[PDB]
């Protein structure tokens, strides 16, 4: 779309003027064969949420998104590049066709764009702080950790330390990986017609953030993109996203505005899914959201959100108000924090 | 440049060319003072659903709608016109402000348009086949019954038997009233800028369907749902798609199967509009029933279901035997529906 491109480009110019965004630099492969590289990565929770791709082959989104990086789980990846052989993708000790299929797609991009004739061995470890739950942004943790390990092995440590370049690589695994690779509070710039190296994540800041807590819940995510995109309301959502992104940039990413927006956006996201016949709502989720909504008026600056799942993230600018809310409502979840250490190393 | 008025006028011309729609005829008052008139009226269930008004004072909707008339409740109205005296509006034995206000908005239109200097006595009786359920189109039953009684008393039996004219009067009580007054399967033509006597209900038809309701309790009042849906950021996209969907159903000659399937899709879209504004229609029991219904639909041939601005569900089928087999297999605890067979309009 031409009007969407115009608004995307306006957003890009505003970000270039702020100095927080730059088109990513590109690198030439200099493969360190037979050496194991290790990297970690963290999941994300959406504030300005994302659903639907403009170009699903390159993972270009229809509009920009904003998330924060959490510690609800952690991913660690081991990568080894071989001159010959077959790719091996191990996920939590399992060698299943499902994981292979998702990996070989980002590796296809890598081999075609950079003319690489090599085999890849990946060992992915995700440690969750919950037994089972959806919508806690696990795919962003895998995408950022795999991108960091591949960047170190294929391009070198200099490239692996370049957050823009690593977000570019992470995007090819999962769109949300752009924001996990970039930092703790980050934005992914994306819109129709954007150049490949311009559609990346970048950090907004590492100060004046907030407190958060998750209520992990079971739900009956790649289908969420198709379901939302096919909604008759999808184009109206995409259009409003450009105006909302412009407004948050003009408001200098004010914390409380983003927290409030994330609550409104949770409802809009659910509405898009509902309008396509996908009911995200489960009985237990309904009981918790009614409890949460009913009590919000009695708290100051307490907000909550959900993504494509029933897990809820409760957020507040005050740690005491958050803990008071969690205790009074007897919520049984996990305390969150922004990760402090990104590891990228040759083993 | 009003795009909704353009698509509205295109729809109107298509309907004129089919010969199923005509601008309503108007009538001069010839009041039969001191005589009691009695009429009945029935609720509706939306197929091409309606929410939000373009002009709330004249009850002009933003787009056209299609519904069917049911027997989930019934309304009976008694009307008497007096030369002098005061208006009296009794609703289920109650004389409350909320009812006087709703009746006065319509009577003000009647007195101003037709230059009537008279008092009106209305006695409205609504008998429901459920307790506390929402979204079963009760306001259409009151609107059609009151319009039939007023048309007989104020304009005469000839005007009361003119379904177009009666739907025009019913619109001033409740928009959905146009469809209830028009017949069992009907469309209300409405869009921004439409002429007053053109915004009426008309009967589509012969080859209908069977239905069954599961009345359920809900939080959101139908009157508030108009404001809630209208305030959604998705409302304009819904309105726009409604014009294209109405053009498509007219070109498909109101095919039953297509309208039943549309009503299922439209139920999701309606819920989405309410959800996007932060209004959750869902309840735990509704969730359990809709999951049971959705899970079994693939095993039935012509079975569909819908809901309006409530948790009440209406199950529909082109076959009575398939519907009863569906209701029995899922052990549904609701009420059997039927299209009303007798419309009463009488003096005394
Ligand atoms: C031109 C026709 C004029 C006649 C107008 C009179 C009709 C309006 C009266 C009452 C509206 C009733 C709406 C339904 C009430 C439900 C309220 C409840 O049950 O609590």
Author numbering:
A (entry chain B): 1 to 220, 223 to 349
B (entry chain A): 1 to 205, 207 to 349
Publication excerpt:
Mevalonate 3,5-bisphosphate decarboxylase is involved in the recently discovered Thermoplasma-type mevalonate pathway. The enzyme catalyzes the elimination of the 3-phosphate group from mevalonate 3,5-bisphosphate as well as concomitant decarboxylation of the substrate. This entire reaction of the enzyme resembles the latter half-reactions of its homologs, diphosphomevalonate decarboxylase and phosphomevalonate decarboxylase, which also catalyze ATP-dependent phosphorylation of the 3-hydroxyl group of their substrates. In this study, we determined the X-ray crystal structure of mevalonate 3,5-bisphosphate decarboxylase from Picrophilus torridus, a thermoacidophilic archaeon of the order Thermoplasmatales.
The X-ray crystal structure of PtoMBD was solved at 2.2 Å resolution. Two protein molecules are observed in the asymmetric unit of space group P21212. The PtoMBD monomers comprise 12 α-helices and 12 β-strands. The α1 helix, which does not exist in known structures of DMD and PMD, is formed at the extended N-terminal region of PtoMBD. The calculation of possible subunit interaction by the PISA program suggested that the most likely biological unit of PtoMBD is a homodimer made between subunit A and B of different asymmetric units of the crystal, not the two chains within an asymmetric unit. In the large cleft of subunit A, a continuous, linear tube of electron density of ∼20 Å length was observed, although with low occupancy. The internal surface of the cavity is mostly composed of hydrophobic amino acid residues, and the opening of the cavity is surrounded by charged or polar residues including Lys94, Tyr99, Arg128, and Glu138. However, no detergents were used in the purification and crystallization processes, and no other molecule in the crystallization conditions would fit the shape of this density tube, so we concluded that the unknown ligand in the cavity was likely an endogenous fatty acid from Escherichia coli, which was used as the host organism for recombinant protein expression. Oleic acid (OLA) fitted well in the electron density and therefore was included in the structural model of PtoMBD. Interestingly, the binding site of the fatty acid–like ligand overlaps with the ATP-binding site of DMD, which has been elucidated by the structural studies of DMDs from S. epidermidis, S. solfataricus, and Enterococcus faecalis.
